[PDB]
């Protein structure tokens, strides 16, 4: 409890390609790099020699593999994968000293799923059974870990924007953040769904019915890059950031993530974004504040950055954009998610990402969409 030195720095990544942890499956152990995705609930690994993959799961080499005789077909807006369901033994070498029998979906066909040039070969869906595919009886990796071992029912993520970071499984490591953690309730255990109760651009309120911030849900999702906002909130949000910084002009396509923008070797013009989240106590909220350093993402394989806030029709998505400013504690045993200022967040001399409270916010339960 409090000190997990072996788990510190166990995530790697390339900017734009996500964060992965090293995992082993089968006996003898097969080492795979696996994408950490708090917005899905399947443990799904390449199992066939797709050209983009460094390595894949070879079930034939595993004496402990058990076939479930059941296929799965998983489409996404862009992307699909199909595979064969089975169970095998799984450990995390830079995670707790335990081995579990987990469901694995061996991906045998995929389209637009794997990234050419990336160093991961599968995805670790850390959310709940309710969105597992094919259905909610396929118990996710984390539920099996907690059922079969003494690991507490929580994990925390420090995503440092070559990227790196830490996934602490079973606890919190205090060296990873400063100040205090503040907690928002998980509204329903499917996605890691939370409730946003107010949004401020450079300390001015968007002044929207708060139901708009969570239409139709808000989630914390390490497997998406952007801060994604409901169309109507997105519209209000760029309008406000345009006005805050209109000392310089940008092509309009920039704000739609349709073209990049460039200086040489200009942060003080861009405002901070505050999201207030529902607190633990009636009428109490807290707020997280992100810097332009989080929402203007550097692009290499071209000083050119992309606007990393985008419109959505699936609700607000607090992606890696947001998470990279914070230590984020997925406190599943108490159905709550904690934020604190990350000890590794990208910043400067003028302002810093922040987590502040308490605030008085009334009618917070109205902000949820039904
Ligand atoms: C199951 C899914 C998924 C994520 C990724 N993620 C990445 O490729 C990636 C890339 C960059 C970064 C960063 N930073 C993070 N993740 C790739 C494939 C995929 F199917 C798709 C699902 C969706 F809603 F999209 F369907 O969103 C989430 N949460 N996970
Ligand atoms: Na247990
Ligand atoms: Na600390």
Curated annotation (Swiss-Prot):
Disulfide pairings: 160-344, 210-367, 262-304
Recorded topology in the membrane: Single-pass type I membrane protein
A GO biological process held by the record: cellular response to copper ion
PTM summary: N-Glycosylated. Addition of a bisecting N-acetylglucosamine by MGAT3 blocks lysosomal targeting, further degradation and is required for maintaining stability under stress conditions. Acetylation by NAT8 and NAT8B is transient and deacetylation probably occurs in the Golgi. Acetylation regulates the maturation, the transport to the plasma membrane, the stability and the expression of the protein.
GO MF entry, a single one: enzyme binding
Residue ranges occupied by any Peptidase A1 domain in the UniProt entry: 19-340
Subcellular location: Cell membrane; Golgi apparatus, trans-Golgi network; Endoplasmic reticulum; Endosome
Active site residues per record: 37, 221
Upregulation: Up-regulated by the Ca(2+)-regulated transcription factor NFATC4.
UniProtKB keywords: Acetylation, Aspartyl protease, Cell membrane, Cell projection, Cytoplasmic vesicle, Disulfide bond, Endoplasmic reticulum, Endosome, Glycoprotein, Golgi apparatus, Hydrolase, Isopeptide bond, Lipoprotein, Lysosome, Membrane, Palmitate, Phosphoprotein, Protease, Signal, Transmembrane, Transmembrane helix, Ubl conjugation, Zymogen
Entry's family note: Belongs to the peptidase A1 family.
Name of the protein in its database record: Beta-secretase 1
Species of origin: Homo sapiens (Human)
Residues represented out of the complete protein: 57 to 446 of 501
